[PDB]
Amino acid sequence: LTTLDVTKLTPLSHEVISRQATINIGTIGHVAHGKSTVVKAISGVHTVRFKNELERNITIKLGYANAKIYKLNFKLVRHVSFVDCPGHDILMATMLNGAAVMDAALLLIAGNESCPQPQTSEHLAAIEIHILILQNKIDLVKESQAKEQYEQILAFVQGTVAEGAPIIPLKYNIEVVCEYIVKKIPVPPRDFTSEPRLIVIRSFDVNKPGCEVDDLKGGVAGGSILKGVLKVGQEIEVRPGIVSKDSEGKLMCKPIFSKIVSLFAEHNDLQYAAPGGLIGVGTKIDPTLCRADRMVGQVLGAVGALPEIFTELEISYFLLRRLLGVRTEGDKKAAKVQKLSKNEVLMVNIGSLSTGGRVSAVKADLGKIVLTNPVCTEVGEKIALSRRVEKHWRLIGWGQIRRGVTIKPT
């Protein structure tokens, strides 16, 4: 059983006290829903099944996969989480907006061909930044395997300018790769002493239909802790809160304060919480206020974090000319990032929080975009800008937050 407690002063990244989730690792590759088999064989099939509802944005939500690497009746050396979502553009936008995203990179590249998909994956990995490639072409000819290894070595030599120094080759090879990763997994610096800060990526309410008179447990939001350490029983605050425009004028965004009743991981998480995982905080919030995925796009703070609610923000427009790492064979203006036209709707993804906005005005220096919903992230965070080419939102450029119009409702 777990050996957790409620006694800790300076948390350690490699401490065995928690043994639940230490570092969030990403798995980026062109597997195209083929990395699921590798992830399952690494950790488990359905180890995380505690709350499911009608999926809201399956293709625009990152999914974690905890994995406790145990070796030596054995001992767990480390317990990390694997993150892999469909669409490398969203992951790259999330990564290039600060830090604490895919601390360890695993590339489950195919060892059969060297098509443009591996090149795009390598370009995305380079733009996001330690990476570890892998050859998934099992059950093939030994000479063909050697030829594919030589081709992958050539590609790695080409990519060594940015990141091209990996080494890899029915789960024996998978176990060897896991052991090598555990050996080479650098410890990342995470601040456990700062004020609590989390981003909610999935809101839930486990109260099934026809509940009891008083047995009404509600307010179990889910997300990832950005900075600090969260303890059960603390008074958490929702930075976004309830935003209502019924005042026949400027919208009023009143935050919500609730005592953190419990904190649960895929397993039974301790009272204290460690950053780098998709943990859920259940508080004294009304289930109506947080319906199925209703409270998404919110920031949970302890003492009212510095992130202030904003309505319109001025960004420093800076986009890429062509498509980063992507170039169609026809190239019939498809892989050509057009100029930032006015009245164009696009999302800015700060960390894991993605908000929508239209470019009301911009002249070569700073676009004043009025956000879709009020947001509270930071005052100078590097905000990315992504636009949908065709049914797939992709990064268009970067910018910096300078000023804007803020609101503070009580």
Partner: protein
Amino acid sequence: PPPLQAVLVADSFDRRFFPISKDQPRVLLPLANVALIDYTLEFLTATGVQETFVFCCWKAAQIKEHLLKSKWCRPTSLNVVRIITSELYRSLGDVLRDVDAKALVRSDFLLVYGDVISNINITRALEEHRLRRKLEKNVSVMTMIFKESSPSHPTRCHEDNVVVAVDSTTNRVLHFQKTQGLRRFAFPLSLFQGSSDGVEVRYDLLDCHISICSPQVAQLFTDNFDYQTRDDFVRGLLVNEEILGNQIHMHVTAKEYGARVSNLHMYSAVCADVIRRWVYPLTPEANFTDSTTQSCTHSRHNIYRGPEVSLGHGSILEENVLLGSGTVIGSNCFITNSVIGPGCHIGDNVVLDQTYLWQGVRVAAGAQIHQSLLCDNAEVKERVTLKPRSVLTSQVVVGPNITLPEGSVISLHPPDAEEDEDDGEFSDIKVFQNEVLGTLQRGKEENISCDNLVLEINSLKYAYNISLKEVMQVLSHVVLEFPLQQMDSPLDSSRYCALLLPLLKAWSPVFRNYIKRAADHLEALAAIEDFFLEHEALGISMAKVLMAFYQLEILAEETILSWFSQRDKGQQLRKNQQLQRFIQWLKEAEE
């Protein structure tokens, strides 16, 4: 079964009614002396809607004032109306996102614009949609309402023509697109790969712009916030068929009528249909919006006469004429297929054909009016002839002795109308190199960051999967071409040297990032040596350019000396004293 609800957008997010919309909301225009909002509210009340939400953004004050006096706002009405105002609204997508934010709807609401004229009972379609939802467990999210019609009908204007492809067995929509200006239509193979039983392509459907929706519609709208219109929503849902299928269905009705007022042509078509009892029982004399002024009596050949019309002597009303209360008609007039608002005054010997006169329109004698609309209080002087499709804005007065052209649209506002109003009438690797050259040229003009150029170079090289040594030669050739491309045709050593100064200053970090290895430094000299031959005008000038490699530590002096030591035309050119002088100057400075 929860009570039925309906959302009623009271603003068309499109400027198709300038200059009429500039001083009056489209939803408040009088079709048959009755506002379009009254028509759509009556249609909603008839089909059993018990709760209606109206969203108004443009000129919401007038809509509020007019609606609060309507029958539906009376306490006795079974249709509970809630009025929402928000200036932030810019598209229907924003309206649905707001609906989802406030969560007014519970399940299975109605989406319809505020300018829809209909008498459709959608009980059958609603029951079919609920049964499909129950059996398929929340897959279907939308049920359109479409009416069979021949493509030649006037209602099917070229702006709103639509072609659809559906499965005839379950009314499961498979493809949907517009047909404005297209001489041919395209259909993806996917439609046939799934439903091998059969597919039916339909072009006889008229878009009623009425949909039986679900809260999932609002959820998707607030998810894909880029969606702006219902057409965008359906196209986005259909293109991404593999994930979150959420198939859309439809129901066809033939014994009912329904159409939205999009433009003046469609407005005239709908008015002609309404006058001809095509929207029964939404006939003018029914007085569904119960008011003293709008009461009228029906007679032969669809002639509707209000109270105290006071018809002149010898005037002839042929057919499809609606006369407002308090109107005055002169002698020997002839009005056919036209609607005249209350309180109008008409001169003598006039001829009105398919025109529409709103409240307060006064017309002098001798005027010929055909296929034209006259807004409120517009006045026409003596002997004025109006060609078809003419438009007169509110309070516009037209003087005598004028024959307005066909496209005549005039208003008090100068720039909106075609004329102002007043008392008068008159007054392989090469492609990668080309992309590198294009990116470098774009970066040069845009003052791009050094990191941005480095990332673009790495991204372009990785996509092309070109070798760094080949890229370095390509980069050096492009860099040499870029300094060469600075001038048009100077063919002078000073032009190349001066241009390469600023070029190699800021881009030195890019050059340093490009070439780092010793073999790259030797290759850079080889590219520079080939650059001198390919740039024979600047080939002699390359002696000073070669020093820039040592000045910025791009190519090592030893590598350059080894390049000169190793020997041909290139060896002979490198043997020149100009190249030797640079070698001696750098070596002496080095030591």
